[PDB]
């Protein structure tokens, strides 16, 4: 898609651990972190964090059941987030992110650290703005 | 101060818990979270997260010993962060943030949740842009 308030939220798996990945669809900018379990409370808390940092209007996911828990619904309610309906499911940051994590994996002991390193690398890599520059440009324009 | 890459990082205490608070000095925009202990590894991990999300050039603090641990130094090294020298120590988001947390405290069970709610409220409150609008404007301008 490409509206500036649209984000996509999914979980991946690596080293037996769960990584929550959010993508700002218009820019390719990512936020990701290892979470202790793939549960509604983790997703809800992550969304509240995300929404305080960026103007999150709608969220999409590739696993719709992710958004059925009462706790997640309460988080979208409180932050005024709606579900996104304009992106069809047609069955990949996850693998690109995983590629980077593999590249920097030995630079740190804990997977959670490597994930943040990969997020950093991803957001700053120019390809010609970087995703990090694109998101702030997109958002600022949309404000003014 | 007011250069766009300057952040300030401090910890506060509430309900026997530790809250790490980072302020983008130019805008007043905040990121904050409860951390399990006031240690170097927590600070280092937080800085890496922060640096992947915003262009962090220099960091200041009101407790200089916060930045003496080897792990913190390694995080600033990896992310290319330097210590800020242009802000003198003259002995307050912490209390403003605490005010908001008090106001929304019953809206959630866990302090960590209320903290994210307070961060959200703080960043979006207009007073006339909001801190959230100011930071992206400041950064985007500085890019172009
Ligand atoms: C971020 C904190 C955890 C991190 C890790 O690897 O997951 C870590 C740990 C556990 N311990 C350390 C001890 C010494 C040094 Cl220099 C660095 C580190 C680093 C480090 C590795 C890369 C960059 C910064 C710190
Ligand atoms: C964010 C997850 C933890 C949060 C809390 O309070 O710290 C929480 C928990 C533990 N349990 C819940 C059960 C039901 C509902 Cl509707 C909401 C929640 C909420 C909630 C409260 C406010 C906003 C969203 C969820
Ligand atoms: Ca329930
Ligand atoms: Ca040491």
From TrEMBL, chains A, B:
Its main location: host cell. It is found in: Host cell membrane; Host cytoplasm; Host nucleus; Virion. It comes from the Viruses. This is Gag-Pol polyprotein. Keywords: Aspartyl protease, Capsid protein, DNA integration, DNA recombination, DNA-binding, DNA-directed DNA polymerase, Endonuclease, Eukaryotic host gene expression shutoff by virus, Eukaryotic host translation shutoff by virus, Host cell membrane, Host cytoplasm, Host gene expression shutoff by virus, Host membrane, Host nucleus, Host-virus interaction, Hydrolase, Lipid-binding, Lipoprotein, Magnesium, Membrane, Metal-binding, Multifunctional enzyme, Myristate, Nuclease, Nucleotidyltransferase, Phosphoprotein, Protease, Repeat, RNA-binding, RNA-directed DNA polymerase, Transferase, Viral genome integration, Viral nucleoprotein, Viral penetration into host nucleus, Viral release from host cell, Virion, Virion maturation, Virus entry into host cell, Zinc, Zinc-finger. It catalyses: 3'-end directed exonucleolytic cleavage of viral RNA-DNA hybrid; Endohydrolysis of RNA in RNA/DNA hybrids. Three different cleavage modes: 1. sequence-specific internal cleavage of RNA. Human immunodeficiency virus type 1 and Moloney murine leukemia virus enzymes prefer to cleave the RNA strand one nucleotide away from the RNA-DNA junction. 2. RNA 5'-end directed cleavage 13-19 nucleotides from the RNA end. 3. DNA 3'-end directed cleavage 15-20 nucleotides away from the primer terminus. Its cofactor is Mg(2+). GO terms for cellular component: host cell; host cell cytoplasm; host cell nucleus; host cell plasma membrane; viral nucleocapsid. The chain holds residues 55 to 209 of 288 of the full protein. One of its GO terms (biological process) is proteolysis. It is a lipid-anchor. Residues 1-139 form the Integrase catalytic domain. One of its GO terms (molecular function) is RNA-directed DNA polymerase activity.
């Amino acid at each position: 898609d490409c509206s500036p308030g649209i984000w996509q939220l999914d979980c991946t798996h690596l080293e037996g651990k769960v990584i929550l990945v959010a993508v700002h669809v218009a820019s390719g900018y990512i936020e990701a972190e290892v979470i202790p379990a793939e549960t509604g409370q983790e997703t809800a808390y992550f969304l509240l964090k995300l929404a305080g940092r960026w103007p999150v209007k709608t969220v999409h996911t590739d696993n719709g059941s992710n958004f059925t828990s009462t706790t997640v619904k309460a988080a979208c309610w409180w932050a005024g987030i709606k579900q996104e309906f304009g992106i069809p499911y047609n069955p990949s940051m996850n693998k690109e992110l995983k590629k980077i994590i593999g590249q920097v994996r030995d630079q740190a002991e804990h997977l959670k650290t490597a994930v943040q390193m990969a997020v950093f690398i991803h957001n700053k890599k120019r390809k010609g703005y970087s995703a990090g520059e694109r998101i702030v440009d997109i958002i600022a324009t949309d404000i003014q």
